[PDB]
Symmetry: D3
Subunit: 161 residues, 6 copies
């Protein structure tokens, strides 16, 4: 067995959702969950079939995003992993409810717009995702000014009243 670190290649600030699913119906169900959750949502979805034909499956509403999802899943090469790439202006908070609720979804490793690397283990014709390096290590702790800043930020973004 060997460990590897695989960076996810994507434009800066682009949001992705990396998870684990099962059953071929994962593709149609997640595509449907996403378009039902947000009108006009632009995304790309890829799912790594882990048996039978063992083909990476894809679906989406934006070819640029579908390409990113597929190419990255080919690099990861992990059975049953899925990757959703969201277009600009679309966020994981808008759709995580639908991903979590999908009957084929088992778990979600990460949802983020930060640079990310995936820790994987490999043995024979199998690979496992061990974790995700999401963004960077902390540089300190917020002071009163920073506490006021994040509270105020959410109000200006329209997320808090």
């Amino acid at each position: 067995m060997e460990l590897k670190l695989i960076p996810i290649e994507k434009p800066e600030n682009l949001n992705v959702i990396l998870g684990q699913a099962h059953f071929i119906k994962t593709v149609e169900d997640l595509h449907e969950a996403l378009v039902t959750a947000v009108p006009g949502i632009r995304f790309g979805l890829a799912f790594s079939e882990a048996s039978g034909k063992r083909l990476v499956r894809r679906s989406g509403t934006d070819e640029a995003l579908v390409e990113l999802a597929v190419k990255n899943l080919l690099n990861l090469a992990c059975g049953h992993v899925f990757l959703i790439v969201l277009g600009e202006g679309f966020y994981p908070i808008n759709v995580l409810h639908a991903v979590k609720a999908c009957p084929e979804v088992v778990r979600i490793y990460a949802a983020t717009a930060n640079p990310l690397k995936v820790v994987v283990a490999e043995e024979g014709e199998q690979r496992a995702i061990l974790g995700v390096m999401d963004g960077f290590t902390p540089l300190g702790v917020e002071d009163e000014a920073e506490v006021a800043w994040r509270k105020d930020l959410l109000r200006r973004l329209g997320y808090k009243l």
Copy 2:
């Protein structure tokens, strides 16, 4: 600390759901969640108590399946992990909702019928599940003909109209 690879023993046609929980009530709650979700469901369930007597706990509607869940948990030897072995014809899409919603369940590592191996870390009398190798690596990417084939499959199975 040492890293180990533990294969999960199970008949190829059976599905297993491996996860993390806490509190002894995990056993009765999951058993109840399963029988409430699917009528006549056959399964075996085991939970690894991580303190006190530190005993593997089990419950089920099929003795052979219960034994299989317990045997695998003894090999995994990870505190607070649980394993459900579903009988033939019962699938994770039928019950993941109930497992996800169980108050004691923290997360699910895998739900699958594919060959499964678990990466674990060990230190002293403690073990951690780091990830799972679920099925195999991708052999390629589907083309439109294959997309048509998987759509056809779901309609023939009655999952899509």
Copy 3:
């Protein structure tokens, strides 16, 4: 890349919930989810901002609980990880529903009162949580007397009728 084992410090009787989220709104949303779930709940919450100023963000009801959450999270030093430390008498089964449903929450690594150690991977200015050592390995399998004990236990605690 290097693997490390990080122990969690806290009184024996306190429960902690360790997970992965994203977006700064994680703090207010989780704080609100907790106080909405249980009246008079006491806790400390910390979230590791993984971009920008990269500051650990915190919120809570008692200074001692907040210190525990922040102190441990700083030791873990993993982007987008969050840690909730529950005060005496408040349990994960009481609030996991609200944590799982939080739109910023991606997954939960562990919920426990047992001694806990976290397996992490580090590369440059990034770290990833690979897994958790929750409590200890199993010493055996429950027999009939122990099955009876755990069933009776739940009735005496008032969790089962």
Copy 4:
């Protein structure tokens, strides 16, 4: 405006789920939710399109059940109401989660195997479901022997341990 009482007819041992939804996608979504929840489930589903051509829509896995669902819905004649008739051995507790979570479902009026009558208000070419007469009025309050009886029943059925 006038009030009417509409009986819902079905085989004594079968369960019906009567609710309110919207959007034509209600039919395929509920059919899929049902077959995904329970393997081999037999049911009949009907939905009353409230605008456009105003046609009762239907789908299912059993002709007799689909016919029953449509006939009952035609008698109800209420825009956006849906009715599911479950085959023998399939219960609302097995599928309510999926009906509740369906994006088109607004609410559920009843889920029962009891004699059922629906109170409706009518005005012009519009009708509203005001409530349901589900079974009969109480004849008294259980004493402890009856408590013991209902507890024993659930243990005999395998719903409680």
Copy 5:
């Protein structure tokens, strides 16, 4: 058929949750859901069995509250209705998630601390809950000072930051 207006008897300091369920397991499941949601919760639960012996079923952690729940159900006399009376300091927001998710629960008519009256329709030995008069009619529309106050109130109570 006749319409009746039935006032709910409840101390001004208590909250109630009135809903519709089915199957005898409603009693143990809802009691379990409440005690799992909030530690030390005080409540009374009653459920109107609508077939068989047709007995009001009861369970709870406070005898006075259980009796009040039963008294109200005897007055309402509606098949399959359930009533939870919450003790002082325990609120519906703390437990509605568990009530909504209970597999036997079909819907919830009301959750409130306000004076409540139930509109019912009666025909033979059957009754239907048509709606609830929850509190009083509006006296106007909030101005900016009132918006500011309702926001400040939630911050002083600790529900918002």
Copy 6:
């Protein structure tokens, strides 16, 4: 007591969600749930406070939509009812998950883009919503050609593959 029929004012290109909630936190919680669910969502929200100041509370991202929601609630005058008016292009299927999950939300009466009327009961200074006339009665049942039509429609719309 008297029954009344109250029409809901709603331009044809808009959708509404009418429901029942409780507690003043309903306003901020629902507004937050909506903006977290869909980016840039345009809506108006009104809530009929049924205690204390008894004011129709208002919040939203579009002044005209907010005013429409408020106007309708002044006409309905039912304690604890809430109304969300969605701007053109935003649909109930996009947000019902968030409304259902809101801790203050008890139930949803209707979600629709069709003409709506509300049946209400009035006694003293209280009113109860008894039901909703959502759209119209059925004109018939779909035949095979119409089934084919509704299936085709969803594929053209991109909701089904």
